[PDB]
Write a protein that binds this ligand. Structure first.
Ligand SMILES: *[C@@H]1O[C@H](CO[C@@H]2O[C@@H](C)[C@@H](O)[C@@H](O)[C@@H]2O)[C@@H](O[C@@H]2O[C@H](CO)[C@@H](O[C@@H]3O[C@H](CO[C@H]4O[C@H](CO)[C@@H](O)[C@H](O)[C@@H]4O)[C@@H](O)[C@H](O[C@H]4O[C@H](CO)[C@@H](O)[C@H](O)[C@@H]4O)[C@@H]3O)[C@H](O)[C@H]2NC(C)=O)[C@H](O)[C@H]1NC(C)=O
Ligand SMILES: *[C@@H]1O[C@H](CO[C@@H]2O[C@@H](C)[C@@H](O)[C@@H](O)[C@@H]2O)[C@@H](O[C@@H]2O[C@H](CO)[C@@H](O[C@@H]3O[C@H](CO[C@H]4O[C@H](CO)[C@@H](O)[C@H](O)[C@@H]4O)[C@@H](O)[C@H](O[C@H]4O[C@H](CO)[C@@H](O)[C@H](O)[C@@H]4O)[C@@H]3O)[C@H](O)[C@H]2NC(C)=O)[C@H](O)[C@H]1NC(C)=O
Ligand SMILES: *[C@@H]1O[C@H](CO)[C@@H](O[C@@H]2O[C@H](CO)[C@@H](O[C@@H]3O[C@H](CO[C@H]4O[C@H](CO)[C@@H](O)[C@H](O)[C@@H]4O)[C@@H](O)[C@H](O[C@H]4O[C@H](CO)[C@@H](O)[C@H](O)[C@@H]4O)[C@@H]3O)[C@H](O)[C@H]2NC(C)=O)[C@H](O)[C@H]1NC(C)=O
Ligand SMILES: *[C@@H]1O[C@H](CO[C@@H]2O[C@@H](C)[C@@H](O)[C@@H](O)[C@@H]2O)[C@@H](O[C@@H]2O[C@H](CO)[C@@H](O[C@@H]3O[C@H](CO)[C@@H](O)[C@H](O)[C@@H]3O)[C@H](O)[C@H]2NC(C)=O)[C@H](O)[C@H]1NC(C)=O
Ligand SMILES: *[C@@H]1O[C@H](CO)[C@@H](O[C@@H]2O[C@H](CO)[C@@H](O[C@@H]3O[C@H](CO)[C@@H](O)[C@H](O)[C@@H]3O)[C@H](O)[C@H]2NC(C)=O)[C@H](O)[C@H]1NC(C)=O
Ligand SMILES: *[C@@H]1O[C@H](CO)[C@@H](O[C@@H]2O[C@H](CO)[C@@H](O)[C@H](O)[C@H]2NC(C)=O)[C@H](O)[C@H]1NC(C)=O
Ligand SMILES: *[C@@H]1O[C@H](CO)[C@@H](O)[C@H](O)[C@H]1NC(C)=O
Ligand SMILES: [Zn+2]
Ligand SMILES: [Zn+2]
Length: 447
């Protein structure tokens, strides 16, 4: 989850992730671009406020008080500079001086042209294969992070798109308690709490940025999939888009789509939760996808209706106590999908975003795996569009986003786990077009 420049014995020992930008006088002579005023290495700011009693294991999980278990000094950039070493720009800015505004448009995937749809499919496939230039992934927890001999960092290179899968897996994985003990599962740093919407917003922002740089196309944008059509087929599952059903196995993607060639990461939970290891970059197994196929669970055999979206946008409070998956009259919990679209909680209901996952009846409907199916990207740009329309309609009212006593990882000033550089829920809780450099070309139904 860290810059490869920081995945070193020296850096892990010093507790400092403050890499050079333009060091002319040797290594360490331009940390954070301080030579040119772009930033300085400074102490980390991390949330110290209480969380709900759902998690009883403080001191046991590296994700706690992110990123203090790994680094307590980081680059603090000035002005509109940003990034791990202050070498890029805050959202909405670009250029070598971070003084050119940028506004990218995220469109309905079905409204793209033939060339644009093809360009997008090729861009995903390229991200699946291209090594992430900056980030490497830990394969062991902190105590074993330097390997058996104490001098070999347990990090791996990983592709741009598998990194997108990995951070998701790491935010939802169980707390490892010890060999021979059951791993603890009532923890999730990106779901079942107020941070669900802002965590997934940054997730997309980061992938869109990495894909722009991979392509060297600064205006590249992620499209969305309007899944609220009431249909019981997947209208983007075609061989020019995200792949039709295989005629040889109804749970695999058609061999006429490159997405039948993808192999998935992080599907060895039994190993991680018993051995105490983490998902690594070795791929194993194809995408499973069987839209409408869950005959044993008929409620998840049809997608949400248009009116379900219109109703969830009538829910006025962003979130409500206990800020969890049983919150009632909470917009966050409604659109996440643990309440029906009017806001009323019911333990048996799956709606909206949750329902769209389960409709896929495959890789895309399992929490630790779901980004492996690239429909995830489009399902979440649409979810992010609902969120952005809510922020417009209710003046980005953050007042019900709790400052304390949220489930762990979901307090307002928590650094969302495991994003780098550190970034809070508050930074994503702004209307996108004015503040984050992107906007949705979309229309909202009535009633
Ligand atoms: C920011 O991180 C700094 C680097 O630490 C690493 O990275 C962070 C992110 C974590 O992952 C951490 O686990 C990593 O170690 C960190 O600097 C380190 O801080 C410790 C504690 O202050 C320094 O310890 C000092 O060292 C010597 C001896 O080293 C060990 O000895 C004693 C045994 O007696 C241990 O208890 C210590 O923890 C040391 O590990 C001692 O001179 C001294 O310990 C004595 O005094 C203190 C205070 O009275 C007592 O707690 C002890 O019991 C001892 O009586 C110091 O504690 C460690 O050397 C230092 N490393 C470096 C490279 O500087 C820093 O604390 C972090 N800052 C913040 C604000 O979080
Ligand atoms: C929203 O969900 C909340 C979290 O729910 C979790 O996940 C779901 C799926 C359920 O399974 C749920 O039970 C899980 O916890 C939920 O909060 C939970 O609410 C329940 C019911 O009020 C609480 O259980 C009761 O808690 C007390 C307190 O326990 C603590 O303190 C005592 C004293 O220090 C210690 O002994 C405990 O170990 C804990 O430290 C218990 O006293 C009590 O036991 C009594 O009842 C049981 C019958 O079940 C008898 O066996 C006992 O003898 C006692 O008579 C209960 O266990 C639970 O703590 C709480 N969990 C958390 C994490 O907050 C919340 O209610 C939901 N909200 C709504 C509106 O539905
Ligand atoms: C990247 O991550 C992947 C995914 O975790 C790792 O690959 C897996 O590694 C695990 C752990 O080593 C492997 O799981 C083990 O497989 C063994 C071989 O299985 C034979 O015997 C079992 C009986 O249990 C049969 O079901 C099976 O068909 C074979 O005949 C088993 O021996 C293991 O169980 C035994 O060992 C463990 C200790 O590991 C004991 O606790 C158990 O009680 C038991 O005795 C275990 O199931 C797994 O097969 C690997 N998967 C793949 C796809 O390769 C990579 O290693 C990892 N890479 C890096 C570099 O970290
Ligand atoms: C990630 O992979 C790189 C190599 O891959 C290259 O860099 C990536 C960041 C991407 O751009 C890839 O597409 C690209 O191919 C590994 O870097 C390599 O590390 C090794 C081991 O430390 C280096 O070997 C050394 O080489 C010299 C001889 O050349 C000797 O002095 C040393 O004894 C030692 O053997 C190697 O030079 C280095 N670079 C390259 C280009 O191969 C990197 O380790 C890896 N990171 C992780 C965390 O696995
Ligand atoms: C995709 O949909 C299929 C088909 O609906 C799902 O398979 C079904 O999974 C359920 C839950 O595990 C199975 O129910 C179980 O059945 C037996 C008794 O027969 C018992 O062990 C349990 O008590 C439980 O009720 C169900 O049998 C099974 N159906 C089939 C045809 O295998 C599948 O889980 C879905 N996959 C994903 C990833 O969503
Ligand atoms: C960095 O970007 C911010 C906006 O993200 C700039 O601030 C705006 O600048 C215009 C033009 O001067 C003002 O009219 C706005 O009122 C400003 N908004 C805010 C929120 O300050 C800022 O000037 C840019 N440059 C820096 C910080 O050097
Ligand atoms: C929905 O799919 C079912 C099987 O899942 C199929 O029988 C049916 O024709 C589809 N749609 C409608 C509108 O009945
Ligand atoms: Zn998710
Ligand atoms: Zn999701």
């Amino acid at each position: 989850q860290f810059p490869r420049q920081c995945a070193t014995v020296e850096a892990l020992r010093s507790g400092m992730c403050c890499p050079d930008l333009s060091p002319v006088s040797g290594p360490g002579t331009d940390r954070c671009g301080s030579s040119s005023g772009r930033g300085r290495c400074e102490a980390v700011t991390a949330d110290s406020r209480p969380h709900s009693p759902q998690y009883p294991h403080d001191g046991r999980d590296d994700r706690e008080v992110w990123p203090l278990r790994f680094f307590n000094r980081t680059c603090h950039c000035n002005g509109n500079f940003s990034g791990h070493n202050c070498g890029t720009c805050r959202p909405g800015w670009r250029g070598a001086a971070c003084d050119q505004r940028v506004l990218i448009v995220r469109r309905n995937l079905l409204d793209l042209s033939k060339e644009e749809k093809n360009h997008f499919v090729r861009a995903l496939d390229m991200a699946k294969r291209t090594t992430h230039p900056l980030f490497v992934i830990a394969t062991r927890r902190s105590e074993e992070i330097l390997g058996p001999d104490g001098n070999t960092p347990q990090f791996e290179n990983i592709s741009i798109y598998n990194y997108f899968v990995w951070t998701h897996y790491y935010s939802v994985k169980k707390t490892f308690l010890g060999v021979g003990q059951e791993s603890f599962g009532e923890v999730d740093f990106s779901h079942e709490g107020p941070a669900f919407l802002t965590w997934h917003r940054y997730h997309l922002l980061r992938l869109e940025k990495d894909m722009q740089e991979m392509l060297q196309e600064p205006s590249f944008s992620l499209p969305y999939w309007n899944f609220a059509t009431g249909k019981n087929v997947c209208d983007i599952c075609t061989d020019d888009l995200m792949g039709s059903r295989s005629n040889f196995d109804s749970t695999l993607i058609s061999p006429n789509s490159v997405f039948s060639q993808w192999r998935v990461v992080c599907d060895s939970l039994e190993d991680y939760d018993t051995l105490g290891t983490l998902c690594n970059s070795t791929e194993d197994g194809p995408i499973r996808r069987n839209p409408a196929g869950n005959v044993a669970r008929p409620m998840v055999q049809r997608l949400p209706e248009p009116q379900d979206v219109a109703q969830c946008l009538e829910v006025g409070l962003f979130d409500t106590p206990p800020f969890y998956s049983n919150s009632t009259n909470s917009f966050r919990n409604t659109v996440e999908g643990y309440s029906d679209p009017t806001g009323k909680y019911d333990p048996a209901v799956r709606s909206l975003h949750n329902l769209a996952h389960l409709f896929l009846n495959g890789t895309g409907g399992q929490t630790h795996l779901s980004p492996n199916d690239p429909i995830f990207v489009l399902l979440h740009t649409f979810t992010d569009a609902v969120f952005d329309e809510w922020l417009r309609r209710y003046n980005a009212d953050i007042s019900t986003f709790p400052l304390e006593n949220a489930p762990i990882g979901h307090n307002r000033q928590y650094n969302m786990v495991p994003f780098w550089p550190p970034v809070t829920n508050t930074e994503m809780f702004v209307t996108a077009p004015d503040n984050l450099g992107y906007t949705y070309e979309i229309q909202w139904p009535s009633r």
